Write a protein that binds this ligand. Structure first.
Ligand SMILES: N#Cc1c(N2CCCC2)n[nH]c1N
Lengths: 353, 13
């Protein structure tokens, strides 16, 4: 066979240990899921420093906790901007999931609260910047470099999916680089606890699985498709379904055709053909052997999965950091003062937040 | 040709 005696036994034992870890992780998750936290701070506890990023509903700002001096990333959502039904439900998903999970590559939520106008989620500040800007600056990552980041996403999805959580917005914009060069996944605005299928049409066009575009009830395998898109974009410098307008992107996704740069290794192309698989009976991550079809693929043969989890692999890139609060690894954004109305807005819609 | 800047997620459609 492909493995000899010692290799096969080591792999089997490793896979059983994963099962044991995930069973304990589920117990811990459910305790926090059953009894969440809320109202653990207020706005005047923080000095607002700089906008780190923007989105449809608000912004993420670097803030400084006045009492401790610790820096954090504060996501501010304008309750009135969270207009549509699925926008509301998604925001409650995001807070509840973030407060309950615990994994080395998932950003940590420290405080949550709301006021008359906004919702606030105060998270760990990750000073190395977005993968997105490093990737666009260098062009493309080498295959070993891409593989180091991909391995962290594989483990993170193995963790989330074991909890019946789907992530649904993988892309380089949502992946922050920490001081050790490892990944922190942020933006759980599209994460959801799903036991089987779900039906919301949501995500980012380039990263959408065909079953989402086709208005089919879909499952966690959409995250494995998105991993294929991410690995392709990291290694090529552009994603596999690439067009100026979303409708054109959607047409390419559903076609079942992908072309690869001539510099892609054959191992990489084989992995990507099995992730970017329109037939769900054939897509890696969705088969009888689950995540192990990915973890045991030839392209990951050099990956020490436990060492990645323990953060003991030398990162390909260590961000430059000049001290706490340094924002040199982030792009600049237009600053807009934070206004809090005298009247409570959308109080009933966000009771649970 | 395609989108090179940051990409916004869509909540519907
Ligand atoms: N640091 C940080 C951060 C963040 N962003 C989005 C724009 C760049 C920083 N989102 N969630 C976080 N924990």
């Amino acid at each position: 066979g492909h493995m000899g005696n010692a290799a096969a036994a080591k792999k089997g034992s490793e896979q059983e240990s994963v099962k044991e870890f995930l069973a304990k992780a589920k117990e811990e998750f459910l305790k926090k899921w059953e009894s969440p936290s809320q109202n653990t701070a207020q706005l005047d506890h923080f000095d607002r420093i700089k906008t780190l990023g923007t989105g449809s509903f608000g912004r993420v700002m670097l803030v400084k906790h006045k009492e401790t001096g610790n820096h954090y990333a504060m996501k501010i959502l304008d309750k009135q901007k969270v207009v549509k039904l699925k926008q509301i439900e998604h925001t409650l998903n995001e807070k509840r999931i973030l407060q309950a999970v615990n994994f080395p590559f998932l950003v940590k939520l420290e405080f949550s609260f709301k006021d008359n106008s906004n919702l606030y989620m105060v998270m760990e500040y990750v000073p190395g910047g977005e993968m997105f800007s490093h990737l666009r600056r260098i062009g493309r990552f080498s295959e070993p470099h891409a593989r180091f980041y991909a391995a962290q996403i594989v483990l993170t999805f193995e963790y989330l999916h074991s909890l019946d959580l789907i992530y649904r917005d993988l892309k380089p914009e949502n992946l922050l680089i920490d001081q050790q060069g490892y990944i922190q996944v942020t933006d759980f605005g599209f994460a959801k606890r799903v036991k089987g299928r779900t039906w919301t049409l949501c995500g980012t066009p380039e990263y959408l699985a065909p079953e989402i575009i086709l208005s089919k009830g879909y499952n966690k395998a959409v995250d494995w498709w998105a991993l294929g898109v991410l690995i392709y974009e990291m290694a090529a410098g552009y994603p596999p379904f690439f067009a100026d307008q979303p409708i054109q992107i959607y047409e390419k996704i559903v076609s079942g055709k992908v072309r690869f740069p001539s510099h892609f290794s054959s191992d990489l192309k084989d992995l990507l053909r099995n992730l970017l698989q329109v037939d769900l009976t054939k897509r890696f991550g969705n088969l009888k052997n689950g995540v192990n079809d990915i973890k045991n693929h030839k392209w990951f043969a050099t990956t020490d999965w436990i060492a990645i989890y323990q953060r003991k692999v030398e990162a390909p890139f260590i961000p430059k950091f000049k001290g706490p609060g340094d924002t040199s690894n982030f792009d600049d954004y237009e600053e807009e003062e934070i206004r809090v109305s005298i009247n409570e807005k959308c109080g009933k819609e966000f009771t649970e937040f | 040709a395609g989108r090179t800047g940051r990409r916004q997620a869509i909540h519907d459609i």
